[PDB]
Paper text:
The polysaccharides in red algae (Rhodophyta) are primarily mixed galactan agars such as agarose and carrageenan. Carrageenans are high molecular weight polymers having a linear backbone of repeating D-galactopyranose units (G) linked together by alternating α-1,3 and β-1,4 linkages. Furthermore, transcriptomics revealed upregulation of the CarPUL during growth on ι-carrageenan, while biochemical analysis of eight CarPUL-encoded enzymes revealed carrageenan-specific activity, thus associating the CarPUL with the ability of these pseudoalteromonads to liberate energy from carrageenan. Detailed analysis of the enzyme activities encoded by the CarPUL, combined with interpretation of growth phenotypes, have allowed us to propose a refined and detailed model of κ- and ι-carrageenan processing by some Pseudoalteromonas species.
Numbering used by the authors:
A (entry chain B), B (entry chain A): 27 to 473
The structure:
């Protein structure tokens, strides 16, 4: 029978900020049990170090730069010269989503929480292969209800923060947003328990603003300031994930449900006190700390519990993995991801991806097996062996000049397959991205 | 007394394709006499290796990337994702031109020939500080008249090729276009001989298409194919320049006229058989062959004949040089060029520009004294000492790693002062630009 699919996708979480990732300071008991129920990927990657492009890759199974979704869509952050601004920045309409492909296979489809794939009506999830929505079009919002005064005083971009049911039915959350999203996902499972369903549960946790349930804050008496708020927000994320995992268990659906847990980008250590241990870097740089994310898959009928998979995988792999599981036999020729199940099961012992790519303007990465070439606008290209240097502290470029040259040529060959970007950030954000990378250049460690 | 100013600006000429630049094969007797009458710059630079951005720099005295004019405006070559296309690509209206500054000093101002600073009415020379125009809005056109059928049946961009008098009075050339432009400039001098005037004579010679006066072709029986056409087109450019220089001499105006001769970008050796000897590279790359140009200034009242100046200078310097000569005392604080006259006269013995910059997307150059750092998307950054290696054959990056790092940081610091581009080329043109660079990577020789 066609399995249910639940994709749980956090925002701005630290690589080290889960029990199953080695945290003793933060508590994620429900997600730790999910990790134990299935396979944990030690080298799971997003397709970009920021939210919008990462989600564009996830939703399409494609390198998002191929359709010009290169720089992040943040209304108010965009160049005065940007081709598209405000509500016009969105996943191009000619792209086929995860939702569209699973609808073709007879699935009920729903998205809860953060969309961030366009604010205009034409970009709405209910036009992009989702039957049901409760969430917000934009990129960040309060974990509590906005007052009438806050909504009346919002700038022209503020409307994308409003919580929305299906197509334009605006309704603020009645309790802590993380709990609302988890309970709504659980209600959807209950309502659709007799048919195949796909849920995209896109928490805004643990993105700013740093707002928590006071009862969650009170569980971390020894933490202070931003770190205390992150701990409480992480406990909330884990509890709300628990509502969904517990509903699957209670209804006897979890055996034939694919549950994925991942994260849209590396932790912004300066904004939400996220910790990417043992990685260097953060959100919005292409060090491991920005692009490597917590990544779990559970499917009890096909995946051994307590297992780990150690070759690189991508969120780009999730569309073809889901589509294959849904018995799909008409996958677009343009898909960059691969079906992971044969790799997870050990039927295919090769690497899912020999070569992987990242790009924002002049900043780009080509990875070939465990060699990682990083290109920058402001310093010579660096070469890392990730098999011996997870924290990217030992530059090998000078000692491997032929490999640097061949990897440079391969990177540019891939860049020639991309469209020009559809929108551009203000110039100042490139200084911020590089300065934050240099601030977090040393390996992070568990506290 | 305020001097007359005549700026003669060729298109796509080879660095070596003039008598005064060391050609024995090509004939430029009028421009050779101009060189002998004044100062020849051995290190004269444009602000970009392509027409539009080069002209935007020339016309403003500013790094054109500071107002987003980074990639060339060619209607039909632009990305489907480009912010501006067709007639909307043009010199931003908030920029003050050479024309505007000289109009403030009580000059009559005229442009003849190629404009290429925007096709829409609002970008027209008569809105940008020019009283008089005979030329074409766009980037290239036939040296002979278009028929009514050719003009009626052109694609939607073709109208920018039509020869135009002042504001929208269309009239095709009655003779070889190079002769028309030179004679019209000479008539303007005659009509305005009793008052200060500024003429911008922007020849389309020696840009494609390769069309010549048959009488000029017949002077080069020993040359064949594209090189024979270039020789004839170059003879025409030199003759038409002669009409202007001879009119100044005949009316007794040349003593107190500043005559400048330069070129919009390096020779496209693969298109018009231009030869950039002794330089490596071409049009649309940032090797010396793309950015270094023939550069002459004559002003008999102030500049010694037969002189050479060997420190780097820029077309960016021409606006402040002209404005100072016109007795201007209110130069904008935003000007990147300097007044060259004190440097030419030896009053200021320093370099006009210690640090110079070039940029198109990932391709950029920072020059510091005679050190040149070249950044590429597809190979490690290279370092040249131009004082010992004019042809950029000996990469010194490996032996000077501290200087590579410091120059990289300085380059990026300048990039942070720029706007994002206002329009973007189709991706395929970056492959063309890099492949042509590699084809002409060796030094050119006379041939
Ligand atoms: O998680 S998001 O990427 O969506 O967060 C963004 C924003 O973060 C960005 O800010 C600029 C643009 O790209 C880089 C940085 O240079 C990225 O970190 C975040 O600061 C803001 O609070 O929310 C938006 C989403 O709305
Ligand atoms: O001299 S021009 O640059 O104005 O000539 C251009 C064009 O040359 C360009 O073509 C693409 C875009 O940038 C590079 C190259 O990658 C530059 O060489 C030339 O081929 C064409 O014939 O005329 C246009 C101007 O209309
Ligand atoms: Ca995020
Ligand atoms: Ca040109
Ligand atoms: Cl951030
Ligand atoms: Cl060309
Ligand atoms: Zn005279
Ligand atoms: Zn004289």
């Amino acid at each position: 029978s066609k399995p249910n699919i639940v994709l749980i996708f956090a925002d701005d979480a630290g690589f080290g900020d889960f029990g199953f990732q080695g945290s003793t300071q933060l508590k994620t008991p429900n997600l730790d049990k999910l990790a134990q129920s299935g396979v944990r990927f030690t080298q799971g990657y997003v397709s970009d170090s920021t939210s919008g492009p990462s989600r564009a890759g996830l939703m399409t199974g494609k390198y998002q730069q191929r359709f010009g979704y290169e720089e992040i869509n943040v209304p108010g952050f965009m160049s005065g010269n940007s081709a598209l601004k405000g509500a016009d920045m969105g996943l191009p309409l000619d792209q086929k989503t995860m939702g569209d492909y699973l609808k073709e296979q007879g699935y009920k489809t729903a998205v809860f929480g953060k969309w961030h794939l366009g604010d205009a009506d034409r970009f709405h999830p209910l036009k992009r292969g989702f039957d049901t929505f409760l969430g917000f079009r934009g990129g960040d919002r309060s974990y509590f209800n906005y007052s009438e005064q806050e909504m009346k005083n919002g700038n022209k971009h503020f409307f994308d923060k409003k919580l929305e049911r299906d197509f334009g039915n605006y309704e603020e959350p009645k309790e802590y947003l993380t709990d609302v999203l988890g309970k709504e996902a659980a209600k959807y499972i209950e309502q659709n328990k007799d048919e195949p369903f796909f849920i995209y549960l896109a928490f805004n946790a643990v993105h700013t603003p740093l707002e928590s349930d006071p009862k969650d804050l009170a569980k971390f008496p020894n933490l202070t300031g931003k770190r205390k708020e992150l701990a409480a927000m992480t406990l909330g994320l884990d509890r709300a994930s628990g509502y969904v995992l517990d509903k699957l268990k209670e209804l006897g659906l979890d055996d034939n449900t694919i549950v994925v847990f991942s994260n849209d980008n590396g932790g912004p250590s300066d904004k939400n006190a996220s910790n990417n241990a043992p990685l260097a870097g953060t959100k919005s740089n292409q060090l491991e700390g920005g692009i490597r994310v917590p990544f779990l898959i559970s499917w009890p009928k096909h995946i051994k519990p307590g297992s780990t998979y150690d070759y690189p995988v991508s969120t780009l792999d999730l569309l073809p993995t889901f589509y294959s599981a849904a018995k799909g036999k008409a996958l677009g020729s343009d898909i960059d991801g691969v079906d992971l199940l044969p790799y997870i099961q050990g039927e295919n012992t090769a690497r899912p991806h020999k070569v992987m790519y990242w790009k924002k303007e002049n900043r780009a990465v080509i990875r070939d097996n465990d060699w990682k070439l990083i290109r920058y606008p402001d310093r010579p290209a660096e070469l890392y062996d990730l098999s011996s240097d997870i924290s990217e502290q030992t530059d090998l470029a000078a000692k491997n000049p032929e490999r640097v040259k061949t990897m440079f040529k391969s990177l540019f060959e891939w860049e020639l397959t991309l469209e020009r970007p559809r929108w551009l950030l203000k110039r100042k954000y490139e200084k911020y991205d590089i300065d934050r990378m240099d601030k977090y250049r040393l390996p992070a460690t568990q506290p």
